Amino acid sequence: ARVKRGVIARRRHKKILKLAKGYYGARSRVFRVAKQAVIKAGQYAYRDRRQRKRQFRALWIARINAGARQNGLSYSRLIAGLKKAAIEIDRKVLADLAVNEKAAFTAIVEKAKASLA
Amino acid sequence: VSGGGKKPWRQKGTGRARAGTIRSPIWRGGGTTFAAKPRSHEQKLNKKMYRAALRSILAELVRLDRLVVVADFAVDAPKTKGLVAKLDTLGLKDVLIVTDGVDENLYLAARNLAHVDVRDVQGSDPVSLIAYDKVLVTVSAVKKFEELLG
RNA sequence: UUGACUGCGAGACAGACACGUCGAGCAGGUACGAAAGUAGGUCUUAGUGAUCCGGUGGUUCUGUAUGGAAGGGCCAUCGCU
RNA sequence: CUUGUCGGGUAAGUUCCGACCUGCACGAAUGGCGUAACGAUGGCGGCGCUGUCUCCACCCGAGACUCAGUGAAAUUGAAAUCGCUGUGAAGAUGCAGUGUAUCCGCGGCUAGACGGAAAGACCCCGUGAACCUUUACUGUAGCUUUGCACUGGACUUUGA
RNA sequence: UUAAAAACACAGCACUCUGCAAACACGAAAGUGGACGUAUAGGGUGUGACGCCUGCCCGGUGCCGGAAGGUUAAUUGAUGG
RNA sequence: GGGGCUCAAACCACACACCGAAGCUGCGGGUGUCACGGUGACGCGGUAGAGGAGCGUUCUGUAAGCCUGUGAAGGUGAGUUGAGAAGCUUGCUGGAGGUAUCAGAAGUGCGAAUGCUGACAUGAGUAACGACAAUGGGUGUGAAAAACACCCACGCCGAAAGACCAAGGGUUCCUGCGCAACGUUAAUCGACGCAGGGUUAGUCGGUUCCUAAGGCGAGGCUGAAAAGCGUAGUCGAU
RNA sequence: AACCCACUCCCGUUGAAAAGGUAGGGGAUGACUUGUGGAUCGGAGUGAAAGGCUAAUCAAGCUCGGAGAUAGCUGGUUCUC
RNA sequence: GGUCAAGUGAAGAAGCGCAUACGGUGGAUGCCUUGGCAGUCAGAGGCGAUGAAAGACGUGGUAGCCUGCGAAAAGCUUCGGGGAGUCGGCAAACAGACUUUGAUCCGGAGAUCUCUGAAUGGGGGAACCCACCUAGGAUAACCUAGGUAUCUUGUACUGAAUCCAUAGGUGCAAGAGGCGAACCAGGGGAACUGAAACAUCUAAGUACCCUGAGGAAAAGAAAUCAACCGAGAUUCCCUUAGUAGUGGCGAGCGAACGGGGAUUAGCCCUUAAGCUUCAUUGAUUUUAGCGGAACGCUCUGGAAAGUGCGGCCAUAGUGGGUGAUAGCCCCGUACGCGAAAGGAUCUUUGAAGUGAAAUCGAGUAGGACGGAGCACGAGAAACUUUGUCUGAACAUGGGGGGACCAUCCUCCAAGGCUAAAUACUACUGACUGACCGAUAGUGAACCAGUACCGUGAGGGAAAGGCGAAAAGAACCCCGGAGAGGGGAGUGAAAUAGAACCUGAAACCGUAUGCGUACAAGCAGUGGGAGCCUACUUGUUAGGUGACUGCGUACCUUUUGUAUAAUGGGUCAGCGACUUAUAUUCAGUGGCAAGCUUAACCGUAUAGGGUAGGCGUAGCGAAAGCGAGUCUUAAUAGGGCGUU
Ligand SMILES: *C(=O)[C@H](CCSC)NC=O
Ligand SMILES: [Mg+2]
Ligand SMILES: [Mg+2]
Ligand SMILES: [Mg+2]
Ligand SMILES: [Mg+2]
Ligand SMILES: [Mg+2]
Ligand SMILES: [Mg+2]
Ligand SMILES: [Mg+2]
Ligand SMILES: [Mg+2]
Ligand SMILES: [Mg+2]
Ligand SMILES: [Mg+2]
Ligand SMILES: [Mg+2]
Ligand SMILES: [Mg+2]
Ligand SMILES: [Mg+2]
Ligand SMILES: [Mg+2]
Ligand SMILES: [Mg+2]
Ligand SMILES: [Mg+2]
Ligand SMILES: [Mg+2]
Ligand SMILES: [Mg+2]
Ligand SMILES: [Mg+2]
């Protein structure tokens, strides 16, 4: 029972060369170089699913800070006032109200200022 | 493998990988690394394990309504038409016929019949009993099975 | 005066193994002391060399048909900067 | 030791020539000391001659350069392939900080790519390999000693 | 096929072996060369035209000679157990 | 680390606030062990290495079955399903074979070994085109002339770069027809392809006659065997 | 001069050439050069001696066998959870 | 609508990137096979001086090569078969023919059979040169047929030193010589390696070289073993048993006794079984052939064997191929028949030869020195054999029983012949395969031991597929009376067009869409505008990715590599934990104080065969004793063992 590897080896090569679509140069057309690029891309994707939550939290904070100072208060003083009184709205929704619903954001900030903090 | 009894090039200086013969398993026309030789794939099965297997199979044939027991079964003259008619009255198509002694006239028939095989009590292997859909045994052959298998 | 004894030996210390170290007590015979008793070398820790092979003294073993012998086994012991 | 010391040659001589004797460590057929002739032999010094040089200049042919035709090679993980100062498998195009910089050829030069070539020859290791040596060990061809055989007779001296 | 030389050879010198079926060399051997030669010849060794010369040591290791004594192989087999 | 910083954006004390990990909490999933009968509780980084469970390829049985010219294997896209190796359904090409399920045997899975064999890249349309005796016109043929043939005129060898024997080669010699490949360019030309033709001896060279070195060697001598030497003899030119 | 050789420089080093070329150079009646045929060879031959030469291979040729020698040493070792 | 100033900034690509669609190169993958590999059952086990194995040259209507033949040359003559086409293949075409008055074709026998090769008349560089004698025939410068090597054996003649005869010299007859893959019996005989070095030892009496014989060879009928009971020639298989021994007592080497089987057989020197060679009596095989049953209709389709419906044959139903898948289309298969003539085997009986050594075994048994073999390496070392040297007795005698002696037992050496069971396969035939399917399988599927490399010995390749059928593209146009194309025609299909099935990847192009000329780095990943396309008309799908946060490949080897340490130019194909025998542990099964067979027999996976192995009892070095035993003076202690 002699086994020939022609059919199965090709099927395995084409799976890698399909994930390497759009890569520059030999990284998309030769198996040896494309194999390393497909593995490295997977390492970056796993790592960058954690940075995505870091990158967006930094962006929301940078926007609540800019919008709170329009109303006369820093970011760190706004969080203390919100926590002291009652408000438990996320930084994702606070950043959205800062941009779109500027009238509601002012009402929230005046609630944090009124808490003496 | 023929030839290849000398080095192709010297050990050092050429710039090529190290080789000692052209008939190497790595080379194109080289030999097989673990080449086969003729060998026997026969196992050992105890006498009482072989008999305990027949006792196990023969019981299921009764439980699955596949063992048909008739009082004797003989056919005169070797004719495949004749045996086909005799097998039709019982409504049997795929049948193994087991008897104490295979008749000369009964062996000549069923030799060309498609899905019919004629055997002997000491000839019926474990594979044959399971392969066929129905098993036809004479009352005499039933007695023989009771003194070779206890 | 010969306990620098013979057969052992509960139980331990050390330790990869092979080796190593201490030892109450029992039985045979002993030596000192009037006797309880002490004595299985020296205040203790160094002073040493596996196996094979060959030699010597014993022996309720074996001994190539049988009776013996040769040879072998068991105990004691000798020969390696 | 040492470029020993003295003399000659040169403006100046670790080399050369002649001497001294303190011969680390000359020496008489593994010959000692001289020697005419000879040497594509080693060292030193002169005359002539000169682009060897100060210091290079011009000119003549063959390449190099452009056009038409044919058409290799070593090398190569992949490249969107800068400088500096640090860090770092301790000498960075690729890391950190920073500074410069539009995209692409052609003719030239070789400072880096620890550039290409050859599984370092130097050094060490392997209870590795060859060949060589001897008063290493163990043998051996050859040479030689004696007993027996082929191989006998007689006489004589001496021994039991 | 990176060394042409002071390296090798050389004429000349010396020591030593060889009496002929020569020493010596190639051959399990027959045989062959030496040599169809015969010590003014043949082999080995060292030095190296020519001139003047070549000094002391025989303790070591070689070679040559000697035969008295001491040791000493196969072989033989008295005696003893 | 840079910009830049002096009642500091430096240092010393005290106070409150915030940022900040894959840590902890929240929500949704998957697994290992233990206990009770699906629930709870504690876990789930990993090299050498131990243990457990699986995917896929070729062949055999199930299978004289099932699928298939109303289109098999193979190739190439798309969509979709799992935790993974992987599975499934279809468009185009293809043109005759494939193997459900469960078992059984392996030449059973490749990116490396300066690995082996083919094909194809980079260097790159880059180096080089093989003595620096040297070429310039006219004509002709031709699809096409720097190179072919002829004519005029230049250069080079001439103790050869001329002529002839031996060895060696073996049709390369001549003619007619050709230019794919060979010719380091083109070719109408050729030592290239095809097809015909061409080598005439008493005196030339061999053979026949004779021998040298040397070879073989009837008998013979010697040697485990193969064989060695050698007499008569008979081969061997230069 | 021919012929044999190979002392110097430069070029060439992917060469016109796996050892050449152009300029000069040594011997050139002799221990000379050369053609043809023959003899000696692998622990063996031959060597005016360089461990040199024995078919571009020599501190022991090439070829086929023992043989897949041995390698405590480098290198490589292929699907998933 | 103006002039000026400030700000802002679309398009415009020499070239390039990504995606997609089409090509090119290239030859993988799939499917296939006229070629290999490995078995089982038979055959016959040699050919050659009557010229072998291996060749050179010639032979055809035309050039070459292969295959056959040999100046009588793809053939000549006779027999036997059949039953109509044929003049071999690459390899087709054009002519000449052959024939039912029996061709080509197949088998038996016969004739011819160039030159070289043991090569054999003498030489020689193989395929060449030069001869002699006899018989016959020509008359010129020859032709036809025979012979002429060497050695061994027998025979006839003759005759050296030397008188006789010995050596020798001639002529006759018969035999040998060379080749071949393995097997068999002898002669000579390594090393690497192992012992983790290496000498004894091992590897191993292996590899290799040489000599003879046969289809088999060899060995064979007790001067053998056993143990006081017995067996009964040799050979091969399973155990005994990796035991007793042997061994720098190291690495290692390794029996026998006794059991179970395959085969059956002995006979002579007061002359036999047997073996050859003829001559007969019969039978069987072999070298070629003959017959050999049963299917129609319909649908798709280029084509039916395939769909649907209904039958028939069977001692023939998983054979090959025919335009796709056939028991009934063809060739076959099961099953019956067949030999003018050759070969072989087994057979009865006549003969000749041999067996064959004459009369029971003397330089023999035994002994001393040096070796070899025995499992046994000098060891207490018995036994066989012999290079050197010696050396008996005669059945009241001799050999052996593992140093040696005594007693018992058992055989008769120094003379011969003998089948079967056993080993092998270069060679031929039949069947089969959980073997390969063109980088695999033979080095070789094809004009392969070829091309090519080497002075030689020697080494040694690459290279398969149109279609069912050549129907292989008439004719026109461009082009050099080209190459190559565009049409037209054949075909189911020419992107099946002869480099022809399918036709991937690397690599090279054309076309469209988006991005790209102020920008610094493993080329990605997270966020993300704009543009283009499709359509479900924007919480959508596909292509592109301006700008921006993080971000120094893979393998190996290491204490540690982005490392400027290794390896890789890329793609495709191949490429590394296997197999046999002995065992130990675990899982899972069959029997159970028992379990299980090996060789072998056999209907041959059954069944038989329980020789043997393990277990039910241990202790001791052993005799031995045994729920105990050993140590010891010891029923003390202690070691090991027992429910
Ligand atoms: C020593 O420095 C060595 C010289 C060796 S000569 C055999 N280095 C060489 O490069
Ligand atoms: Mg991209
Ligand atoms: Mg691509
Ligand atoms: Mg790859
Ligand atoms: Mg071969
Ligand atoms: Mg070889
Ligand atoms: Mg080999
Ligand atoms: Mg070899
Ligand atoms: Mg290299
Ligand atoms: Mg090898
Ligand atoms: Mg291979
Ligand atoms: Mg390969
Ligand atoms: Mg092969
Ligand atoms: Mg059985
Ligand atoms: Mg049947
Ligand atoms: Mg303790
Ligand atoms: Mg006491
Ligand atoms: Mg007292
Ligand atoms: Mg005895
Ligand atoms: Mg006895």
Ligand SMILES: [Mg+2]
């Ligand atoms: Mg004794």
Ligand SMILES: [Mg+2]
């Ligand atoms: Mg000095």
Ligand SMILES: [Mg+2]
């Ligand atoms: Mg001075």
Ligand SMILES: [Mg+2]
């Ligand atoms: Mg002066």
Ligand SMILES: [Mg+2]
């Ligand atoms: Mg000077």
Ligand SMILES: [Mg+2]
């Ligand atoms: Mg002197």
Ligand SMILES: [Mg+2]
């Ligand atoms: Mg000297």
Ligand SMILES: [Mg+2]
């Ligand atoms: Mg001196």
Ligand SMILES: [Mg+2]
């Ligand atoms: Mg002198």
Ligand SMILES: [Mg+2]
């Ligand atoms: Mg002297």
Ligand SMILES: [Mg+2]
């Ligand atoms: Mg001198």
Ligand SMILES: [Mg+2]
């Ligand atoms: Mg002098």
Ligand SMILES: [Mg+2]
């Ligand atoms: Mg000179």
Ligand SMILES: [Mg+2]
């Ligand atoms: Mg001088």
Ligand SMILES: [Mg+2]
């Ligand atoms: Mg000067």
Ligand SMILES: [Mg+2]
């Ligand atoms: Mg010039």
